[PDB]
């Protein structure tokens, strides 16, 4: 079973906000966009400036494999956790996320040479992260929590789409000071603007095959390559061979 | 795979998803305060956070118990 | 003060089934947005989710008849604490439908 | 039974962030990305710089053995723990991780000399409750908690792959100031960027 | 049309038509409280609503049981 | 229109009893916060905060007592 | 709005093809590894 | 998100009420450190440090009082 | 329209007791400031400042004692 | 006369015991507020107010002990 | 492996690892000053060190007590 | 024969084996503080250990009773 | 309002009627403007038949 998740997003924010106050004669107070009382020395303004732009792209692919007999129900289930580590790296705070998946199936052989299956799929990221800074979100990709149950039949060795989801969105906003926002040379100083775009695609594809012949090369014969190539191999110890001999082969 | 949750679990989860971030705010506060204990700006903040945490945990527990006893009293009458 | 706002969202779930077999599809997802100011420490988030139950039937007319239950939306949130997130993540209603159509 | 796990990781971070404040004779005050002013006259801006690269690989192999009699169900169960000291060794408690494995089996002999077995297998590292040092994860490789339950039959002395998993992912992000990030010679002072790549394989 | 309902159901349902909205009020009060679990104005309200809910459920079940025992004791004399 | 029980009536009597204290405490706290050391603001605030503490205690204890008087009767229907 | 369709034919290209294209175009691909091939062969080759 | 409770919203009042005292104190000390024998500076610093002391006391006492008001109500659910 | 408790009444008794002292102190300081070196002014201010200090103390200690009584009676309802 | 219970009788024994304290304590306050700085007045008020404090606390505690005796007997009629 | 430590242990130890060397600096300064009690540069140092040590030990013990109360209140509700 | 142990025994023993050495740590820290009652380091240590021990014994004894109350409730229905 | 109508043979209409109306008794009127601005109306209930 193949599961694919793709994500893209673009963000920009840019502009200013103004507020302030003036006291005249100590007898008339004037204030501009303040939701609060003022200390009346006056002649006090603030311009809050923001300017940021960002782009993000993420992609995740996962493919479980499970062997079963005809008419026999079978279950596969697997959790996994991932960590990320942050500057100040001596300090004891890893951010982490947990992804998990399970599949329960019941296969049937049709006379037509077709495989019919009853399916449950449950998959996704856990609902309750505790990310406080963005670092965890920019490091580790969110995916939904998704549940499907259905029946499907597929010609032998072909493949099929059981479910999928797509989402697209856009947003725009602008603020301005009614008279100044249109001044010819400085109007742009009195404006605020923001834009958001998002696109998401998620899909589930199934692809069954009949298994007639065992593995070639032998499992052990492959393992022996892996171990040596990795240097994990330690069968050289004169001390361990004394017993490894009983396990490694007849 | 995913946890079965009852009803009491839903009640507890309302608090857990109510205080979005307090669970970690408290820890960060402690870390920096412990780094420099003699700063009254750190102290004044940590006092607030710790108090909010205390109230949150207390209310959560007391609530769960009340629902437990309502259910128990209804179930008893089946016999 | 003068302000303008515009938003647009489109979702398209797809589900495979067989005739006379009931089926279920269910998803939800969290979206996050960085929030400027406050040394850019701040972050906001929202959850959207959708669920569909369906029962298909084949008419002799070649028409397909569907028994449908749909529930969709954003989770209700009394917690809203800022402008820019409400400016950056759309609101969408909480909506429930149950009906038959062919 | 052969259990094999392989894991590769590539990570990089590079670039800068900026903020600050300005004042003009106590006439006007300006903040750039900051929600309070320093009362400063275009002075003490702050720049935060990140530059780091890392690569990692881990390989784990495990093999249990169990003897049984025809038609007799049997169980094997093992649990074991491993420790790491840390640098800054004056006083840093030992980090540790626990691995555990359980197998239930029932063997049947075919007339054709094939062996058929009912199997239930459960192997994994136990979940870390909440937080751990950044060094421990470096020394002790994470592995899943996996559960399989199935029937298989195999020609004599041959082998079968009963289940497996693979995960592949990549991510990239860039942040920048709308006009300065586009300058030919200094944009790199106003861009920040990050990458993440991962590849994992698990088989039984 | 509507499902069949007995005398015990009519009795159980009386209470529910009596407390017009308590079932909803008890939920929304909880979500207000859990959003800010340290406001005494929210807490004093929730205490009241939760008490009312408790007494309601507990009176409903005891009344239904007493009517069951009256009927089972009449039917025991047909023989 | 909404339903309100006997305990809600008992509680509400206090709220309609202390007519304005809920607003008085808020504005007295903002007036203090504007000048955290002024003997008249301190002397006012100490009074209003004390009256508030006593109000919330008496309300919640009374509602508790009535809840127990009711539960003790319902138990005997059984 | 609702829009149903009858399904009679499988995917074309195969999932194994489209997924491989996405992997290589995104640089997520890893089959180049000298080591993992020893195992991945069983999954992709069978 | 900057989630804040009730006690948080109380505490924040004083921080916004004393508009600038936090910086003022630091600056007055910064300059006085360079010339300890200027009385025009000593007199300034005595006042700023007094204001600071009173502000931090009033703030932590008020937060403590509202904690007890809440805990008392919570206790009565049972 | 005001609202006043019992502690409010007790407190206000002192305010209506000392008719004018709160203005008297402010004006004595006002004139003294203009000529800090005059003995008659110093001698007048020394008295008024003391009367004021004792007034504020006796006020706050009485209000506390009453609050402590009520808090102990209400405790016995439960 | 209105109906009065056994706990009312017990309560009233105190009030009728302290014949005049109930008002002595108020007159003392009215006088002391006139000149808060007279030690002859302060020395008297301290005494009256201490007596009042002890009186109210003994009253409430006694009432509660009899409530819990009666409740314990009534419980066993079942 | 390492001596068993609970949550409170791991909270208390956070302070100790926060004030990296204060525990030594206090005894160091104390000995230097005891060597020559009438030296203002030593007195002005030891005043600061001892004040810091006092504040640290105090805030440590208060925080450990608060985290004991939060737990006991929860455990009581199991029954 | 090997000493018989039931389900409540099992549940109880999980705590004893869960706290590896606390049961002796609290004895050593006492003998130390008793040898030198006026050292703040020894005090700050013992406060933690004694708290952890108190919480352990409470959580144990409550959990065993909760189980006993389920078993006793089921056995009543055999009649 | 709750009603049940019956047509007469004369073309008259007969209705079983229940009515209630008013302000909810939550007296906010602590301050003069409240009573000045918002009219009190009585709380009233009627139940009868008319044709």
């Amino acid at each position: 079973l193949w599961i694919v998740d793709l994500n893209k997003s673009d963000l920009e924010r840019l502009g200013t906000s103004w507020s302030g106050s003036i006291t005249i004669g100590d007898k008339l107070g004037v204030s501009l966009n303040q939701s609060s009382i003022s200390t009346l020395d006056g002649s006090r303004f603030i311009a809050a400036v923001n300017a940021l732009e960002e782009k993000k792209q993420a992609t995740v692919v996962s493919r479980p494999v499970l062997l079963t007999q005809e008419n026999v129900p079978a279950i596969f289930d697997n959790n996994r956790t991932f960590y990320t580590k942050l500057i100040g790296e001596r300090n004891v705070a890893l951010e982490h996320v947990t992804y998990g998946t399970m599949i329960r199936v019941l296969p049937r052989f049709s006379a037509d040479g077709q495989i019919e299956m009853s399916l449950d799929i449950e998959d996704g990221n856990d609902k309750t992260p505790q990310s406080d800074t963005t670092t965890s979100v920019d490091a580790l990709p969110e995916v939904g929590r998704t549940l499907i149950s259905t029946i499907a039949r597929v010609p032998h060795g072909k493949s099929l789409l059981v479910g999928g989801y797509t989402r697209d969105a856009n947003t725009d906003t602008v603020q301005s000071i009614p008279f100044l926002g249109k001044l010819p040379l400085i109007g742009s100083l009195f404006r605020y603007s923001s834009k958001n775009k998002s696109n998401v695609v998620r899909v589930f594809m199934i692809e069954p095959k009949e298994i007639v012949d065992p593995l070639t090369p032998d499992a052990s014969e492959s393992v022996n390559n892996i171990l040596k190539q990795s240097g994990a191999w330690s069968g050289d110890d004169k001390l361990q061979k004394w017993v490894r001999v009983y396990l490694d082969r007849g | 795979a995913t946890p079965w949750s009852g009803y009491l679990d839903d009640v507890s989860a309302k608090f857990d998803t109510g205080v979005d971030n307090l669970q970690t705010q408290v820890t960060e506060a402690l870390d920096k305060l412990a780094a420099k204990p003699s700063d009254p700006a750190l102290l004044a903040a940590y006092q607030s956070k710790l108090s909010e945490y205390n109230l949150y945990r207390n209310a959560q527990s007391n609530t769960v118990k009340v629902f437990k006893d309502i259910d128990a009293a209804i179930i008893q009458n089946f016999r």
Side-chain angles (χ1 to χ4, degrees), chain A, chain B:
Chain A
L1 178 73
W2 308 89
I3 317 171
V4 181
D5 193 293
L6 321 164
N7 183 299
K8 293 175 63 185
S9 187
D10 187 312
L11 169 66
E12 186 173 343
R13 297 189 181 128
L14 185 59
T16 309
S17 296
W18 296 88
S19 57
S21 63
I22 306 178
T23 307
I24 70 174
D26 311 332
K27 286 185 176 184
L28 180 58
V30 185
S31 67
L32 178 60
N33 294 330
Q34 305 202 30
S35 305
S36 289
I37 317 97
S38 317
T39 311
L40 303 187
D41 273 1
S43 300
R44 175 70 272 170
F45 289 87
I46 302 93
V49 183
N50 300 326
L52 186 60
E53 180 176 8
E54 176 161 20
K55 298 175 180 288
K56 172 188 162 187
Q57 183 182 346
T59 292
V60 185
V61 178
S62 303
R63 185 279 308 274
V65 182
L66 180 63
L67 189 74
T68 66
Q69 292 186 353
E70 172 178 1
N71 306 331
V72 171
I75 189 170
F76 176 82
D77 174 340
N78 182 91
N79 297 324
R80 206 179 179 96
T81 300
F82 296 90
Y83 298 98
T84 188
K85 43 184 166 177
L86 304 176
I87 307 304
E89 178 278 335
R90 208 183 197 207
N91 293 320
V92 175
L94 295 161
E95 313 301 320
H96 70 70
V97 176
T98 302
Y99 310 84
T101 320
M102 75 142 288
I103 317 163
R104 191 188 298 94
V105 73
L106 181 56
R108 181 186 92 72
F109 280 106
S110 181
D112 300 353
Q114 300 187 348
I115 296 174
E116 186 159 67
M117 297 166 288
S118 180
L119 300 175
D120 301 333
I121 302 95
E122 175 182 333
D123 175 75
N125 176 23
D126 188 77
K127 184 176 290 182
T128 312
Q130 291 295 352
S131 52
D132 188 35
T133 73
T134 189
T135 60
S136 172
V137 176
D138 295 312
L140 301 180
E142 168 61 342
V143 297
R145 288 136 291 287
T146 315
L147 167 61
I148 306 175
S149 184
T150 192
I151 301 181
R153 177 182 72 258
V154 69
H156 186 294
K158 316 308 292 180
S159 68
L160 196 56
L161 182 77
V162 300
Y165 176 83
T166 67
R167 184 179 175 283
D168 312 303
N170 189 290
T171 292
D172 308 280
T173 186
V174 61
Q175 320 181 29
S176 82
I177 308 303
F179 303 115
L180 314 182
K182 299 300 203 68
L183 293 169
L185 307 184
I186 68 176
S188 68
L189 279 64
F190 306 105
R191 302 178 199 143
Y192 197 93
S193 71
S194 178
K195 303 182 173 285
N196 293 42
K197 184 177 178 170
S198 177
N199 312 100
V200 180
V201 181
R202 188 158 167 78
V203 292
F204 305 73
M205 310 170 186
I206 197 163
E207 185 201 330
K209 319 171 200 294
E210 191 189 331
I211 310 300
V212 189
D213 307 331
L215 307 169
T216 312
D218 295 336
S220 64
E221 305 182 314
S222 299
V223 171
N224 286 287
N225 305 348
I226 302 170
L227 292 170
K228 290 179 176 182
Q229 188 172 338
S230 308
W233 171 266
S234 304
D236 320 313
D237 195 348
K238 298 72 166 180
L239 195 61
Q240 300 203 351
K241 290 177 180 193
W242 293 113
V243 285
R244 285 186 175 259
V245 66
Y246 297 110
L247 303 184
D248 291 352
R249 222 166 180 165
Chain B
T2 56
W4 183 88
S5 65
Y7 187 71
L8 304 180
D9 299 330
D10 298 331
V11 173
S12 191
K14 285 175 175 298
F15 296 93
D16 291 350
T17 63
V19 298
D20 283 321
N21 198 19
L22 178 64
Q23 166 66 94
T24 197
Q25 293 178 358
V26 176
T27 314
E28 302 309 327
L30 176 58
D31 277 327
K32 71 183 63 180
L33 184 282
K36 199 171 62 178
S38 59
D39 190 338
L42 305 183
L43 291 163
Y46 186 57
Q47 189 215 347
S48 298
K49 299 302 178 183
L50 191 61
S51 302
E52 284 288 359
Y53 194 72
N54 186 333
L55 301 178
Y56 147 76
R57 284 291 173 211
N58 212 281
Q60 182 184 50
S61 184
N62 290 266
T63 306
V64 166
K65 208 197 184 186
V66 176
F67 285 96
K68 183 197 181 183
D69 298 342
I70 301 163
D71 299 347
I74 306 161
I75 295 163
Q76 183 168 28
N77 298 346
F78 292 6
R79 309 177 67 188

